[PDB]
Amino acid sequence: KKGVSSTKNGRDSESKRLGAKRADGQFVTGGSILYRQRGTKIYPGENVGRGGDDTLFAKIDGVVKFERKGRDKKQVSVYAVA
Amino acid sequence: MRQTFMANESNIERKWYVIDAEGQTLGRLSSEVASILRGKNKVTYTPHVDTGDYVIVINASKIEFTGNKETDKVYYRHSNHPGGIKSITAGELRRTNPERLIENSIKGMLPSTRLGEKQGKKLFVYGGAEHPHAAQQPENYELRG
Amino acid sequence: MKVRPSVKPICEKCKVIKRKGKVMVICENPKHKQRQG
Amino acid sequence: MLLPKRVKYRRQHRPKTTGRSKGGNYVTFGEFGLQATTTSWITSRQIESARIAMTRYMKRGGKVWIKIFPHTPYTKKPLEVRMGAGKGAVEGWIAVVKPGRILFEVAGVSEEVAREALRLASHKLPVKTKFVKREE
Amino acid sequence: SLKSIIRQGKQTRSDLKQLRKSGKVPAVVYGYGTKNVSVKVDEVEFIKVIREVGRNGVIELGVGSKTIKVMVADYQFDPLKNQITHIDFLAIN
Amino acid sequence: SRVGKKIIDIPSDVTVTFDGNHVTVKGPKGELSRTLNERMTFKQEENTIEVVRPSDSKEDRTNHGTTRALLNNMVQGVSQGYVKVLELVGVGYRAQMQGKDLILNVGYSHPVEIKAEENITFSVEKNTVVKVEGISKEQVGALASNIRSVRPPEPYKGKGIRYQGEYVRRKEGK
RNA sequence: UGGCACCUCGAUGUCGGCUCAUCGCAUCCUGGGGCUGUAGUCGGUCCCAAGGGUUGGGCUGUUCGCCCAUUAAAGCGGUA
RNA sequence: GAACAUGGGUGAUAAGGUCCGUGUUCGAAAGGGAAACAGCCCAGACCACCAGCUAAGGUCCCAAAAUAUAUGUUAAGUGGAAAAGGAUGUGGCGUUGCCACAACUAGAGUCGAGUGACACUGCGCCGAAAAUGUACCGGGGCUAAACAUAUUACCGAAGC
Numbered sequence A: 001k002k003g004v005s006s007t008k009n010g011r012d013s014e015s016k017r018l019g020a021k022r023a024d025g026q027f028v029t030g031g032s033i034l035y036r037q038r039g040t041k042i043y044p045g046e047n048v049g050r051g052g053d054d055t056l057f058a059k060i061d062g063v064v065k066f067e068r069k070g071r072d073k074k075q076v077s078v079y080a081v082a
Numbered sequence B: 001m002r003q004t005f006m007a008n009e010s011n012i013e014r015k016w017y018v019i020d021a022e023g024q025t026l027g028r029l030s031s032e033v034a035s036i037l038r039g040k041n042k043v044t045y046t047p048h049v050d051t052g053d054y055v056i057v058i059n060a061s062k063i064e065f066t067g068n069k070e071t072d073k074v075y076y077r078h079s080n081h082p083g084g085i086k087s088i089t090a091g092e093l094r095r096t097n098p099e100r101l102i103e104n105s106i107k108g109m110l111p112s113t114r115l116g117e118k119q120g121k122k123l124f125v126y127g128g129a130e131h132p133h134a135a136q137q138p139e140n141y142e143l144r145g
Numbered sequence C: 001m002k003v004r005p006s007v008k009p010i011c012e013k014c015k016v017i018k019r020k021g022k023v024m025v026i027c028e029n030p031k032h033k034q035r036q037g
Numbered sequence D: 001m002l003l004p005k006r007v008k009y010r011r012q013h014r015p016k017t018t019g020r021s022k023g024g025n026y027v028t029f030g031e032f033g034l035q036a037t038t039t040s041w042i043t044s045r046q047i048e049s050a051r052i053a054m055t056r057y058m059k060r061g062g063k064v065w066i067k068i069f070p071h072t073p074y075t076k077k078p079l080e081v082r083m084g085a086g087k088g089a090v091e092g093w094i095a096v097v098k099p100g101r102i103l104f105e106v107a108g109v110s111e112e113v114a115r116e117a118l119r120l121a122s123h124k125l126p127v128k129t130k131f132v133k134r135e136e
Numbered sequence E: 001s002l003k004s005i006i007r008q009g010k011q012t013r014s015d016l017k018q019l020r021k022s023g024k025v026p027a028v029v030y031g032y033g034t035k036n037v038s039v040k041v042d043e044v045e046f047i048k049v050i051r052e053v054g055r056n057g058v059i060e061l062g063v064g065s066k067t068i069k070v071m072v073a074d075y076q077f078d079p080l081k082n083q084i085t086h087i088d089f090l091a092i093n
Numbered sequence F: 001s002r003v004g005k006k007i008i009d010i011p012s013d014v015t016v017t018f019d020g021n022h023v024t025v026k027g028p029k030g031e032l033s034r035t036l037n038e039r040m041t042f043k044q045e046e047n048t049i050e051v052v053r054p055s056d057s058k059e060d061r062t063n064h065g066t067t068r069a070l071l072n073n074m075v076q077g078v079s080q081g082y083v084k085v086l087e088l089v090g091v092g093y094r095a096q097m098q099g100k101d102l103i104l105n106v107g108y109s110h111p112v113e114i115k116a117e118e119n120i121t122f123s124v125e126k127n128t129v130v131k132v133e134g135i136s137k138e139q140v141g142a143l144a145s146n147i148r149s150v151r152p153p154e155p156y157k158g159k160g161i162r163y164q165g166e167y168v169r170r171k172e173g174k
Numbered sequence G: 001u002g003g004c005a006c007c008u009c010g011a012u013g014u015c016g017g018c019u020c021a022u023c024g025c026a027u028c029c030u031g032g033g034g035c036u037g038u039a040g041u042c043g044g045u046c047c048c049a050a051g052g053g054u055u056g057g058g059c060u061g062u063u064c065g066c067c068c069a070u071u072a073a074a075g076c077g078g079u080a
Numbered sequence H: 001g002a003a004c005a006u007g008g009g010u011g012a013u014a015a016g017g018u019c020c021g022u023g024u025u026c027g028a029a030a031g032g033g034a035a036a037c038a039g040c041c042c043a044g045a046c047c048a049c050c051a052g053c054u055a056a057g058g059u060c061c062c063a064a065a066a067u068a069u070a071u072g073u074u075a076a077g078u079g080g081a082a083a084a085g086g087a088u089g090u091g092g093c094g095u096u097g098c099c100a101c102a103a104c105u106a107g108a109g110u111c112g113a114g115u116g117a118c119a120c121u122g123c124g125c126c127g128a129a130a131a132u133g134u135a136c137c138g139g140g141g142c143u144a145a146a147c148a149u150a151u152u153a154c155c156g157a158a159g160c
Helices: B027-038 B098-107 D052-058 D111-122 F058-079 F137-146
Strands: A033-036 A042-046 A056-058 A062-068 A074-079 B016-019 B054-057 D032-036 D040-042 D064-066 D095-097 D102-106 D129-132 F031-033
Touching: A042 A062, B016 B027, B027 B054, B027 B098, D032 D111, D052 D064, D052 D111, D102 D111, D111 D129, F058 F137
Parallel strands: A042 A074, B016 B054
Antiparallel strands: A033 A056, A062 A074, D032 D102, D032 D129, D040 D095, D064 D102
């Protein structure tokens, strides 16, 4: 019944939909998106490139391949095979 | 509809039986009497007519019960009055008016219909004295399944 | 007598035996004696 | 009242209470351990209302060694009000125990004292206990 | 200590808890010449480990063949029961 | 289990004959009493009834110690015959007899009367006291006890009539 | 004293007092007791016991509450 | 939108409370079982029949079918409603040890036959007080017509 002492909270922001966008072993187009994330969780490998410090995209057609780089770091690649 | 014999009046005949409760355990000797009163031991039994025979007891003061139910298992009764709870009789009511004891027990295992009330009026229980129905030529059932 | 659920053989003179519903105790003094409650 | 000093967050979640124990299933600092057999939240106030008492039986005799410390501080609202306008201010400190954990440890003193002392102490805690004899 | 176990069986469904009240334990020897070829022991002949080795020494095995000194090393003590589960040995080589 | 093979004598002024579920002690010591002793398998071969009925039933080990003693107390108290004494603590009990109706007094404005039964002898060497006899302690006992408890003796200061001897809880106040 | 909002807003309409009741036991009086730091009268805590009893006034509207004079006693509650 | 079963937050490991997540049923679903009971268990009605086999649940009487068989467990009517505790309750699991332990007594000698702490238990016992009337086995009643297993036979829906 009594006007309460209110809440010093309540704020948040819209989610960005990060993660993988193309599956390993499937065929693509030149220029398609493969992953979206802050910082380089998965490095760009063969015939792929990093955009503006994110969006690892493909540069030529073919099939994608996820792989390990050194000991603890991964990478993505595309091969021309048809 | 098809062929199904239906027993009716002037086609069924009732008899007279005599059971003895010398070494019975009330309940066990009550369920076997209810079936005979309902007439569920004939091949021509219909559930819309009064089929069966009459039963007569001659030893209602010899009934026994195992366990401590002789001191417990009290009988309650109301008279539709503010605080009319009547429980004067308990489990030792087999010495005073024991005919009602068996009567109620056998009347508590019958249907509460208009035909189930007239079927319970074909039972005569006696404390220990012999029955005066010698002109009915009652057959001695005694032995129970 | 006393009445509490935690009866036992209380002092070094009181010792127990089961009755009907009470597991009360018998001994020499009426300052240590109890029946279940 | 075994409580800490510096805490990052003051409002937390109720701890999980299911399954067996993890660590502290044995005894070190003394010959004799008091085990636990069910699950509950011991709440610092038990501990100091079941420590001073065990020592008031011990008459400042031998020494004890506590094997339970309340970390997660539980909170609670004051007077019964409406539902939901924030969270109540922290007012307690809780510790969670599971079956198979030694809560107290003592040394040197006779086994008659051990039995007739942990039976005194367990009569305050909401968990059911059982004696342990360092049974190698 | 002359204590003898036998080669028990794997591919076990977990229906053994109930054949466990009747005494047993697992046991697996380490060391060359054989492998984790497990052996099954019983308890109330271990109600007398009190005199057997202490904790550090020798035990016979009689486990068909290669019956030599084998050392039960680890501990797999169990809560809430005063029971035991999977005590296990090793070869001396 | 308690008292199993404690097969003791029956050297009597009497005999024992078993048909029913009981005994009966006809002897010049005590003529012809018995209850129903035991529905156990009772024997009596040449002088005594010590019959090995009960075993392996929890009820059986109290049945033994009870029904060997139904027979036992009956045969003995109807053979032996043994009631001990009672006490005279105070001044002014008026102890007497009138057949099977004695008298005492306690300090009531009106000495209230008590009368007893037979088969328990009304024995009076008693001028401020009680000391009686009979045959069966089951029947001299409850009456040796109605006489115990007329004015429960002063648990402070001495007055009363009671049994053969113990201590009473003696209490003090202002 | 509160918490929840499941029946009722084409109406489930009112706190004390008056009149008349009925049920409970967690017993105020009477009764049967073991135990008292109970000699006796008395009285304190406990156990069993629900049949019937359980007063007239002064003072604010008081369901409360204090006071006056009695009585074997002036018990606590449930029943919109 | 609702309940039930799970995974969390919030509140008091309070609510037939409140907010999200994954399923099913009700909503829009009749039929059989749970004494009566939208949400629980079994199962989805096109229409006729005085045909047959089964599911959950059951087979002394009310009321269809075993007063079936073999084995144990239980003396409270437990079954047929709660907890910390308490203890000369107990059927099973291990001890420990006198060849004395029941009447010995220090706050020493015998005679004749079982004694106990401890440990895991399975079933019981006490802890257990409310207002119209017995008053949660549904009722009569039951020492098996109860509980834990095994194998059977038969009954049972608008399912086949």
